[PDB]
Design a binder for this molecule. Structure first.
Ligand SMILES: c1ccc(COc2ccc3[nH]ccc3c2)cc1
Length: 204
């Protein structure tokens, strides 16, 4: 499938730096069409420890449901490049909604940043689109990225990134319904191979 539900679909996601653009990670679901197949599944239990077991932790979130709203993205990021560091997200749906978008940056399973944004639906092409464009990337991530690009060896970046995760929770602001919950894990790619990603379903 893709990263989305009947109610809300991710359309594009990127994290980038501008002085053109450099993209650290990118999901295009404009992609688009598959030809096949469905998404592989990963047992959400094997990643409880990469996020806080406190309130709003993975286990708590998944317990309430709905379980089909839960995805894991593995990113191989491109760190070969002080400009403007940005994140851009676009969702779409057929219903009119206001979204609450929470991003939780985690280091060794502890939250070091929570970022909460709100985005109202916008009618376009007979569907509703939710554009969170050019949101300044938090300072901790900028500083982290500047240190990460210093490491002399890709495998050392990977070692450092094995304890770094992001949890993104999109809820219907009005109703409090969870719409999408995405866990992100990270390695690095080469400049030659370019950034890449793999989306899974989280199951239990
Ligand atoms: C390591 C590699 C790439 C990057 C790109 O920076 C971001 C920033 C916000 C994000 N939200 C979901 C993935 C994501 C990525 C950060 C750290």
């Amino acid at each position: 499938r893709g990263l989305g539900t009947a109610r809300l679909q991710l359309v594009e996601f990127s994290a980038f730096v501008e002085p053109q653009r450099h993209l650290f990670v990118h999901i295009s679901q404009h992609c688009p069409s598959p030809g096949a197949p469905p998404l592989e599944s990963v047992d959400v239990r094997q990643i409880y420890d990469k996020f806080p077991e406190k309130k709003g932790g993975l286990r708590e979130l998944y317990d309430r449901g709905p379980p089909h709203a839960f995805f894991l993205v593995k990113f191989w990021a491109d760190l070969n490049w002080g400009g403007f560091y940005g994140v851009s997200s676009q969702y779409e749906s057929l219903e009119h909604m206001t979204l609450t978008c929470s991003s939780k940056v985690c280091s060794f399973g502890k939250q070091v940043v929570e970022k909460v944004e709100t985005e109202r639906a916008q009618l376009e092409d007979g569907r509703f689109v939710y554009r969170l464009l050019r949101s300044p990337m938090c300072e901790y991530l900028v500083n982290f990225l500047h240190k990460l690009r210093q490491l002399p060896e890709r495998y050392m970046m990977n070692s450092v990134l094995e304890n770094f995760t992001i949890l993104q929770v999109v809820t219907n602001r009005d109703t409090q319904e969870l719409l999408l919950c995405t866990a992100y894990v990270f390695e690095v790619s080469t400049s030659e191979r370019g950034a890449q990603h793999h989306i899974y379903r989280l199951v239990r």
